[PDB]
Amino acid sequence: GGDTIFGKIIRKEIPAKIIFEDDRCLAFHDISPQAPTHFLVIPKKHISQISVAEDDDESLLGHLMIVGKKCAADLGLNKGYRMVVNEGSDGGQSVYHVHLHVLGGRQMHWPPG
Amino acid sequence: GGDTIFGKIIRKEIPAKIIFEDDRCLAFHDISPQAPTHFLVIPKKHISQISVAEDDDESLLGHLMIVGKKCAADLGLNKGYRMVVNEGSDGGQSVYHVHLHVLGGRQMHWPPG
Numbered sequence A, B: 001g002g003d004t005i006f007g008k009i010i011r012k013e014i015p016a017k018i019i020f021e022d023d024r025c026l027a028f029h030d031i032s033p034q035a036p037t038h039f040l041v042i043p044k045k046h047i048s049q050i051s052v053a054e055d056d057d058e059s060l061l062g063h064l065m066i067v068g069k070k071c072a073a074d075l076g077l078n079k080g081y082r083m084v085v086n087e088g089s090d091g092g093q094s095v096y097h098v099h100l101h102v103l104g105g106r107q108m109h110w111p112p113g
């Protein structure tokens, strides 16, 4: 293969508990949760990182946030949540396939790392 | 007025150092920076928080991330960065006008708050 972990999730080579799926994206629970609710929203299109996303990806990127919103509501995050994108080394990025974290179910602190 | 701080920035009632502006959004440095580079990207359209954004706002929300990318590059964040959206009480949201943080210039830690 040679793709990323999230490429493998998309092709059902690596398992994941999927909580939302449409023709453009998937959402699934994070394997190493940092809050009582912690899930990821990823595009099915491969983009390695936000710093190489293109202008015409705007609708797709916003779609990740809207899906994040919908999933947060489904999971009962009525007191709020935090969305995060990690870019590159200083962002702590591990998986080079663009994705959004959504964390909630506890008070989130500041700074955000 | 009765609007938010960022509503006031948009109408030039509260000052800000603006680093990007187009017909849809503004970006400016955060007044309480948590990293050597810390700026915000906001839509000119008022949306109180991400949890009430609508499907047809997807392009606008993605535009904030693309502008964040462009500004990060302008500011020399070649080692990476983190993007953050704070929603509601648990997200620590202070200003009820949708916006994206971009932080870089240091190693960002985990969890992200």
Ligand SMILES: Nc1ncnc2c1ncn2[C@H]1C[C@H](O)[C@@H](COP(=O)(O)O)O1
Pocket (backbone or CB within 6 Å): A005, A014, A015, A016, A029, A030, A031, A032, A086, A091, A092, A093, A094, A095, A096
């Ligand atoms: N197999 C699997 N299932 C679910 N979640 C996973 C898996 N592998 C890694 N992860 C999560 C762990 C991190 O929160 C994120 C990668 O770091 P980042 O900094 O976001 O690139 O993705």
Ligand SMILES: Nc1ncnc2c1ncn2[C@H]1C[C@H](O)[C@@H](COP(=O)(O)O)O1
Pocket (backbone or CB within 6 Å): B005, B014, B015, B016, B029, B030, B031, B032, B086, B091, B092, B093, B094, B095, B096
């Ligand atoms: N006047 C002004 N200029 C620039 N930045 C400002 C100003 N007032 C507040 N802020 C920043 C401070 C926080 O990082 C964010 C609000 O918290 P949040 O959790 O993001 O809603 O907005």
